[PDB]
């Protein structure tokens, strides 16, 4: 399952 | 040693071009693609039959949510990185690879790595448990992520617990395709150019990708003068590779090719038969 | 900018009249925009499919490009690759192992 990326 | 793996590849670009959508996220189990999110379709979709049969509709809808969310995150990230690097407009690319591996010892190794325009940006590892910034621009993100302590918490929790548990679930779903052993079809080709004979040992359509291809001259190993190709993929999910040597034409019959692969009951020996 | 590496290969050992697939595996390049053509005697072959875009540990992209075909003994099969890092396109000939 994917996980969401975090804002940099 | 790695028994199985589950990893994802995220490619996001500032300006889409033919064949390169705004955002694509791809999942791989032991190197085989099995799921895909694409910003043009806006849907998480199966790429194999085993994942389509075993997953419930909630699986595909929750990840469509995660893909839609990541799509907006990368738009902001691309915008943010353009000024931190004092860059002008045009094609810019943010890449992310993350996942886990189940080792033979029972442990799990996991990582999440970001790249920007072909260079490291920021990374996280289960061993170090800390974010590694590649330059001062990435230090801005590292400081913010370390303050809240929450990125490192979510990252450790995904890579060490969620990722391997889904991996074990994926291994059981496609066990028949993941663990199949298809032997290579081997052929030795020969061409004489400019007084030099070039012998090429080709291996067609083998799975999995582990293979040994070696040339022998008499009783001696000839790896010294052997040029190897990569282990490259076919469109059907199998692999291809070759091993090439140069020889005097008059000594063509002293050379033979040995190929070993998990799909062969015995290692096979081959030679050029013009 | 990194120039692409190109390997050309068929799915199976070539046999006359037998359906095959001609692959062009392009690796090691950046930025990801690239123009790939599969030609038979300099003519674009029908049904060229672009594989999916991935990257390696050094953030260099790669892409499989392939087309169904029947290898014939007196024609020239080539993959032609154009990239911003290259001053001119380069052709990579597929050598049939009949």
Numbering used by the authors:
A (entry chain K): 1 to 8
B (entry chain A): 2 to 275
C (entry chain B): 7 to 104
Q: What do the authors report?
A:
MHC I molecules are expressed on the surface of most nucleated cell types and present peptides (self or foreign antigens) to T cell receptors (TCR) on the surface of CD8+ T cells. MHC I molecules consist of two polypeptide chains, the α‐chain (including the α1, α2 and α3 domains, encoded by exons 2–4) and the β2‐microglobulin domain (β2m).
To further clarify the importance of methionine as an N‐terminal anchor, the structure of Acar3 was refolded in the presence of a third peptide KTMMQAHDL and determined by X‐ray crystallography at 2.15 Å resolution. The structure displayed an unambiguous electron density map for the peptide, and when modelling the peptide chain in the electron density map, it became clear that a 9‐mer peptide cannot be accommodated and that the peptide bound in fact is an 8‐mer, lacking a large side chain in the middle. Since Acar3 was refolded in vitro with a commercially synthesised peptide, it is apparent that Acar3 has a strong preference for binding to the 8‐mer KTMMAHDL (abbreviated here after KTM‐peptide) instead of the 9‐mer KTMMQAHDL, which comprised the majority of the sample. Next, the two methionines, in the positions 3 and 4, are anchored in the PBG by backbone interactions to the side chains of Tyr99 and Arg97 with Met3, while Met4 has no backbone mediated H‐bonds, but its side chain is accommodated between the two hydrophobic residues Ile67 and Val74.
